[PDB]
Structures are given as structure tokens and as C-alpha cells.
Write an enzyme that holds these catalytic residues in place. Structure first.
Site, PDB file in Angstrom:
ATOM      1  N   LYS A  99       0.940  -1.181  -0.058  1.00 49.14           N
ATOM      2  CA  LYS A  99       0.034  -0.021  -0.329  1.00 49.14           C
ATOM      3  C   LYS A  99       0.518   1.601  -0.173  1.00 49.14           C
ATOM      4  O   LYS A  99       1.710   1.441   0.963  1.00 49.14           O
ATOM      5  CB  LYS A  99      -0.943   0.317   0.850  1.00 49.14           C
ATOM      6  CG  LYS A  99      -1.694   1.543   1.058  1.00 49.14           C
ATOM      7  CD  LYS A  99      -2.733   1.298   2.202  1.00 49.14           C
ATOM      8  CE  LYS A  99      -1.614   1.612   3.463  1.00 49.14           C
ATOM      9  NZ  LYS A  99      -3.048   1.575   4.651  1.00 49.14           N
ATOM     10  N   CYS A 125       1.031  13.786  -8.315  1.00 43.45           N
ATOM     11  CA  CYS A 125       0.421  12.908  -8.979  1.00 43.45           C
ATOM     12  C   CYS A 125      -0.534  12.315  -8.435  1.00 43.45           C
ATOM     13  O   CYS A 125      -0.596  11.224  -7.414  1.00 43.45           O
ATOM     14  CB  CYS A 125       1.244  12.027 -10.110  1.00 43.45           C
ATOM     15  SG  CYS A 125       0.752  10.860 -11.008  1.00 43.45           S
TER      16      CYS A 125
END
Ligand code: FES
Ligand code: FES
Lengths: 65, 65
Positions: free
Chosen positions: A13, A30
């Protein structure tokens, strides 16, 4: 469908955490997972949106002045 | 081929957010999966996405040192 195709797949993760005092005047992050400078936006979202019909874009953190 | 954002503000052709550091509290947690109901903020929806798809995405944290 996965969102992230290629970035740090050994990490289960992917989270980034930055201190705002370590930031310059401006940081552009981003949110498309296509940047070659991930976590930073390199403009790869434009290609992604064109190819897929999507509407995703970056997150900007800046100093007011 | 596949879009990343399925449902969020699809009337906006490119979703970008911009914040000034001064208006951020101690910690902001921003969604990078396009599944949060509090988008642009993370609400933990990434965990379900990752479980459902085998992906490894998570948020961007901006915080005070
Ligand atoms: S490169 Fe991913 S949002 Fe700009
Ligand atoms: S809800 Fe999207 S990254 Fe947490």
C-alpha cells in the site's frame, strides 16, 4: 482493473507523507499513477486521459505568497 | 485502456486541486484512488479498492513537522 500498473509493486500500500516545512514554493503531486517521477506529476495524466477518456489530474500544494 | 476515475465530477474535463499550505491544518490526507466520497480527501476507500482489485494504492499526506 488496477489503478497503479507498475509503481513499487513490492509495497502492499503506497502512501507518501511530506512535511509542509520541507516543501518549496510549490509541489505538484500525481494522482494518476502514470508519472515517471511518482509521487510527483510529470504531465503523464494528459496521455492517460486522451487514451482512456478519463478526467484525472494532479494535486497542487503551494505557498499563498 | 481503463479509466482510473469512474464517477467523480465527470462534467469536469480535468480534475485538479490546488491548496495553500497556510490553510492546511496539521494534517491533510488526500485521495489518490478516486474512490473517496470526500474526494479530494481520503476516506479509506482505497483499502476496498486494493482488496477488490489486488492493487496497492494509497493516499498523499501533507503534514506539519
Ligand atoms: S502525472 Fe499523474 S497526475 Fe499528472
Ligand atoms: S480514499 Fe482514495 S487514497 Fe484513500
Amino acid at each position: 482493473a488496477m489503478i497503479n500498473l507498475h509503481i513499487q509493486k513490492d509495497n502492499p500500500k503506497i502512501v507518501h507523507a511530506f512535511d509542509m516545512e520541507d516543501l518549496g514554493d510549490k509541489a505538484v503531486y500525481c494522482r494518476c499513477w502514470r508519472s515517471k517521477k511518482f509521487p510527483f506529476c510529470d504531465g503523464a495524466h494528459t496521455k492517460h486521459n486522451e487514451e482512456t477518456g478519463d478526467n484525472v489530474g494532479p494535486l497542487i500544494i503551494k505557498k499563498k505568497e
